[PDB]
Design a protein around this ligand. Structure first.
Ligand SMILES: CCCCCCCC/C=C\CCCCCCCC(=O)O[C@@H](COC(=O)CCCCCCCCCCCCCCC)COP(=O)([O-])OCC[N+](C)(C)C
Ligand SMILES: CCCCCCCC/C=C\CCCCCCCC(=O)O[C@@H](COC(=O)CCCCCCCCCCCCCCC)COP(=O)([O-])OCC[N+](C)(C)C
Ligand SMILES: CCCCCCCC/C=C\CCCCCCCC(=O)O[C@@H](COC(=O)CCCCCCCCCCCCCCC)COP(=O)([O-])OCC[N+](C)(C)C
Ligand SMILES: CCCCCCCC/C=C\CCCCCCCC(=O)O[C@@H](COC(=O)CCCCCCCCCCCCCCC)COP(=O)([O-])OCC[N+](C)(C)C
Ligand SMILES: CCCCCCCC/C=C\CCCCCCCC(=O)O[C@@H](COC(=O)CCCCCCCCCCCCCCC)COP(=O)([O-])OCC[N+](C)(C)C
Ligand SMILES: CCCCCCCC/C=C\CCCCCCCC(=O)O[C@@H](COC(=O)CCCCCCCCCCCCCCC)COP(=O)([O-])OCC[N+](C)(C)C
Lengths: 214, 214, 214, 214, 214, 214, 214, 214
């Protein structure tokens, strides 16, 4: 439910020397933060939970669970961005070593107005000190290697929580389990009494509804 | 049920210096207002609700509920417009800084008749003071950043109503729950009596229908 | 069941100065009128309804209902025509301000024989006083804005009938409800007697059908 | 089951001055007549119906019904032909006003051998007195307007038969209803007796079929 | 099950002056004759039927039925050939009036070696006395008109057999009906006795199959 | 299950004067012979059938049946080859009458090295005595006519076996019918005894499997 | 499950005079050997079978069965390779008769460095002694003929094992049949006892699980 | 669940002489290691297993099983990389024998800056000592041969574990089987008691929920 957005969600990368960090860093942080606290609003175990959490048990449970199953969305929508390589080229294009690993120099301020124009766009000035195909696929390299290094740092970190017992014990987990299926039971518990008691005054008001004219 | 309309619904953007604000602001406000008060007409809990709401309980409920589930359509059809970037370029094209972040100047009134012609269309005059690919993807940038900032302002705002108790208490919600499944019950309550009582005069009039000729 | 016709139903727009109003206004009025009184012929509650409606109750009901559910087809097939913009350009092409918002003039009658040739077709004469891409997408603008203004005038108008009680009361609606499922009941009421009574003379004539030769 | 034939069924339009009326009028009349009396052969209530209809009741029913449900095929396969515009251009191409609404004249007989060559084909002679794109889309206009005027003349006419009582009364309709489900009942009536009586001589001849060798 | 073959079944039309009649008339007669007596071999009511039909009742039935339901395949695979127009152009290309309705003449035998080369192929000699696009779409015209005239001659002829009583009476049809479901009954009649009697010697030979080693 | 192979199974046609007969006749005989004796290996009524068929009843049955239902594969994969026309052009390309029905002559041996190069390939030498499009579509003609003549010779021949009684009588067919469903019955006959008798020693060995440690 | 791999599995054919035999013979032997002993690992009747097959009955059965049903994969993935013709051209390209059936000669070692470059690749040197289209489609011929000759040698060989009794008798086949459905029976035999006995200590440990706090 | 990632997961191959080994070896090791210890986190038999595995039976089981079924993902995502040939060309491009099997030499350091630019990219310098199509499809050869040699080394190695008894005996496997379906049984064991005991205080608190106002 994350990578599908990346198919049609376009990317812009404004080639202006100094706004790049914004639009670059803007797209890598916002969707995670919005995806995180959006799926959290979907789990129905949230509403009353913060209600009684301010008056002064299960105080350390029923919040770690939501924190886990709702924290899979951001970590995937932040890894797929790195592996593509369009979010990284847009940002650090202004800091590629020119005279080496690219020869002649140029003035300082105008150069930033030149090298900043070497993402994907077809408005790049061209020849001097750099060929566009050589600049890219070098920054795309550093992203993907830095990318895979990220997911190792997470998937390994997902091996301790599901293998160690942070808040997984019979202190409140078992007790909180007692809250599991009472509420939905209360849905079909009072509903039968509610639906039945509605039948009490049903026939009473229904008097004129039987027949008369027909 | 919102983004699907944006697939085939064309966009025009009339390159005339002064009507742009209309056609731009026209398309960003109308569909929300029409989508809002259209889904509201779909919920069957609306008809009698305004009926008795003028004679002088549940006065503060049964209207907030409809206001919520029917207010998801506009907020999505107003975010997708920003992220695309065709509604914003059409409007503020007349206020892009020319001499900087774009050099030679020109007369005032004719310039508005020139810069106003730089959306998507292929009738742009061209060279002076601006390249068309540089104008766009700078306004497309400001939209998307302003766009994501919008949805954060909403999805976070969708975290207080579903986590705080605005009109969520046992004052009328429980009482209004008693109105929940009586009406549909009344559908199949009098129907059995109605369908049965119809069988009363059925055999009476059916006398000549048994047989005679055959 | 309306917009699907607009996919393959071609459009012609004859570039002749004076027939345009016909073929333009012809296509915007006829399909509504034919769609309206066609779906009306589909509701089975129509046949006897006009029968007894001329001899001199439910006189103000059982006709407003059909008038509603069968009046959704035209209002949609008349909004989709405006939003496209091909029905409006074909008509008012002869009244676009030339010397402004388009320079040199020309004779009166021949001009109508020129400006009338600027819809979609690729037979337009060309240069003088107007560029074809500038004429269109200005009339396409006025249509869409006028279009959305239409649907607001209707969807809002669809909020009073479903929220006010024009003919929605227990004067004949409840009485007319008594006619609801008697007729279809009469279908399977006399059918069992008819199908049964057919079995009366069945065995009588079936005498020679048992066996003899075999 | 009508418009589908129009997808792959090719059209020819022989550009010969005098056969056009044949091939034009030929394709607009034949498929209706063949579609009409073809679906009539499908309704199983036809066979004996004409049998006893010549020896000298239901004499005015059981033929109007078939005449209705089998007369929907032609009226649709004759409207779709008009709206397309390829059946009309092929016919009246020889009678388009040349000197006006099209300038120099020509000899009479050769002209018919020229104007007759202006349907779709790419063998048109060209320049004089008419541009091919102007001839078509003027005759295509007159067809579609004449087309929609047709379907109004029919769909309105389909509003009197389903709203007036031509042969819809309890004179023979109810009596003819008695013939409704006897015949199919006679199918499974004698079949059980036939299938059963077959079991009579079944075991009789089956004597040598039990066992002996095995 | 007929027109589907016409999709991939290629057509050749050998442009040789004198073999055309063969390959043309060859493809219009053979598939009907093969389709006719092929579906006839599918109806299981054929095998014994010709068996006892030579020793010297139902003598005039049980053969007309097969003759009808198996004669729908050829009549459709012979109409679709005409309407296409590739079977007719291939044959009568040698008899198109040249000097009229097409000017200069030529020698007799070589002309047949020229006009015979004007089907679809792109090896036509060209200019003299005929343009290839004018020859075709004139013979394609005569086919389609002659084609529709055919299907009228058949579908009308299909209105007398299903409306008159050629061999539809209670002379052998009812008697032959007695043969309808006895045979398939005999399938599951002796099968139960056969399957049962097989169980007789089943346990007898199964003696060593119970157990011993295990 | 035959024509599907002809879709992707490529064809080569080596243009060498003297190997053509091999690769041509090679592909028309092998797949039939392999398809024939392959489907024969699929019918489970084959294994023991040849077993007891050599020791010295049903001797003339139970082999004609397999010979029929397994001989439908080759006759279809040998007709589809003719109708295509690529198997025939590849073979008899060396025997097309050149000086007539095609003018100047040439030496004998080199000519065979030329005319042999006129299948589909684009390495044909060209001009003299023959145009490539005229050679093909003449041999493709003779194949298809010879092809349809084949299938008539078979489908008609399929009308005598299914209408005459070659080995269709109550001499061994009825007796062999007694072998029909005993074997599969023997599958579920001893299986119940086998599966049951397995339960004998099941509980005996299962002693240590109940419980002890747990 | 074999030919599907051949769709996307690319082929390389390194045009180097002397490695061709390796990469050619490498791809024709390995996949068979890996497919053979891979499907063998899938049949669950293999594990214990080799276990007791070394300590010193069914010694000649239960291994021939696996050898058959798991030997269908290689024989198909080795026939499809021949019929394509890309595995054979890659190998024997260095041994095509040049001076005949292809004229001028050349030095020995360099020639091998030339003729070795005439597979599919577009780096072939060209003119002398051979045209690339003539070399291929001659080796492609010898493969396909040699290919079909292969499958005849196998499918015929598949007619003796399924028609003769190599290891098909009541010596161990019937005895080994007794091992057929005991093991899976043992799955659901001890499972019911295991699942039941688990219920023994279930209620014992479940004491504190009933209720107390709630 | 492995090869699907290889469809859209792009590949970069940065043509810089010395980073190639990193990006090459980086992509061949990381996904295996991440796929391995990711599927391991999916098997629910892992959590408590490491818990009690540190306090100082089944000590040598319940870890070999997970090690097997979760070690199929890496071995497939490491074989598909070799067979493609894009991971190997990217690495060893700097060590292809130039003067042989490719003539003139060049300086040492610049040469590495040239030969390193001969993967897929279209920035290769060109002519001297090597043609790009000859370099590739020679390294692609060595990969595929080395590739198939790999999978033989594994699939054969997968024949001993499933045919020998490493940890497959009745020492702890049978005992560990006793842990198989108790836990899920404990899910629906205490749940019925938990769901039931919830019904204890259900009616107690439900007192005010029956009726009063209605
Ligand atoms: C068509 C569909 C497309 C498919 C996509 C294909 C491509 C796929 C590519 C890659 C797939 C990678 C999968 C990753 C592993 C997922 C599991 C996981 O992580 O769960 C853990 C998450 O919670 C944590 O414990 C981690 C928290 C670490 C902090 C990270 C900061 C994030 C904020 C951003 C700031 C960054 C700033 C720094 C910027 C550098 C634990 O929760 P869980 O509930 O126990 O997990 C259950 C695991 N299970 C589900 C298997 C059992
Ligand atoms: C193929 C399909 C395409 C998919 C699209 C993919 C792209 C998706 C992109 C983005 C997705 C973004 C999702 C947003 C969050 C939705 C939820 C929500 O907001 O609900 C809230 C809405 O009601 C409110 O409380 C907000 C009201 C704020 C006022 C906004 C003005 C709007 C008028 C316009 C004037 C603007 C003028 C100013 C112009 C700047 C609360 O109601 P709820 O019932 O409690 O919500 C339940 C939430 N749940 C559903 C999860 C539980
Ligand atoms: C993918 C699919 C494609 C879809 C197509 C999309 C395009 C659609 C475009 C258009 C759709 C138009 C629909 C038309 C209305 C149909 C109903 C109707 O007409 O029934 C009537 C027909 O019988 C009559 O009463 C009319 C007879 C008039 C005579 C006409 C001459 C015809 C002969 C030719 C000579 C011409 C010579 C003159 C030449 C100028 C009455 O019968 P009914 O049984 O009561 O009808 C029930 C109606 N109901 C079904 C709703 C209840
Ligand atoms: C994707 C699918 C493609 C669809 C195709 C779309 C295109 C469709 C185009 C057209 C459709 C046309 C349909 C035709 C009508 C069919 C019905 C019929 O004819 O039955 C009759 C046939 O038997 C006869 O009575 C006729 C015999 C006349 C002799 C003809 C010679 C044929 C031999 C050749 C020598 C020629 C030599 C002369 C050369 C000039 C009677 O039998 P029935 O059992 O009572 O019929 C039941 C009718 N029902 C089925 C409705 C109830
Ligand atoms: C997408 C799918 C593609 C569809 C394809 C579309 C194209 C279709 C085109 C054409 C379809 C043609 C169908 C043909 C008829 C089939 C029936 C038949 O023949 O059965 C008979 C076959 O057995 C025989 O009796 C014939 C034996 C004659 C010997 C032929 C030599 C063959 C060896 C080669 C050497 C050649 C050397 C000489 C070279 C010149 C009898 O057996 P049956 O069991 O009683 O048959 C039941 C019939 N039924 C099934 C209807 C009841
Ligand atoms: C659309 C879908 C695409 C399809 C793809 C098509 C292409 C397919 C192409 C090829 C398919 C190849 C299949 C391989 C066989 C799989 C089975 C197997 O191996 O299981 C074994 C794995 O565990 C082991 O025993 C092997 C461990 C060896 C160490 C390898 C190092 C790996 C680390 C990397 C470092 C490398 C460093 C060195 C670099 C050179 C045993 O476990 P099992 O549970 O008993 O297996 C059951 C087998 N069964 C499943 C049949 C019963």
């Amino acid at each position: 439910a994350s990578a599908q957005m990346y198919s049609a969600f376009d990317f812009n990368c404004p080639c202006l020397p100094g706004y790049n960090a914004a639009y670059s860093a803007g797209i890598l942080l916002a969707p995670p933060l919005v995806l995180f606290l959006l799926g959290l609003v979907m789990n129905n175990n949230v509403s009353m939970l913060a209600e009684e959490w301010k008056r002064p048990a299960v105080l350390r449970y029923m919040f770690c669970s939501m924190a886990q199953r709702a924290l899979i969305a951001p970590v995937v929508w932040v890894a797929v961005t790195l592996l593509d390589g369009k979010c990284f080229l847009c940002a650090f294009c202004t800091a590629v070593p020119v005279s080496a690993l690219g020869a002649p120099g140029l003035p300082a301020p105008e150069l930033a107005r030149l090298l900043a124009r070497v993402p994907c766009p077809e408005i790049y000035d061209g020849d001097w000190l750099l060929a566009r195909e050589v600049a890219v696929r070098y920054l795309r390299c550093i992203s993907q290697a830095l990318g895979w290094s990220f997911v190792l740092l997470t998937t390994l970190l997902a091996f301790v929580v599901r293998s160690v017992r942070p808040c997984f014990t019979q202190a409140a987990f078992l007790k909180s389990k007692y809250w599991s299926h009472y509420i939905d039971i209360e849905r079909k518990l009072f509903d039968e009494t509610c639906t039945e008691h509605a039948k009490a005054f049903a026939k009473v008001c229904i008097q004129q509804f039987f027949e008369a004219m027909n």
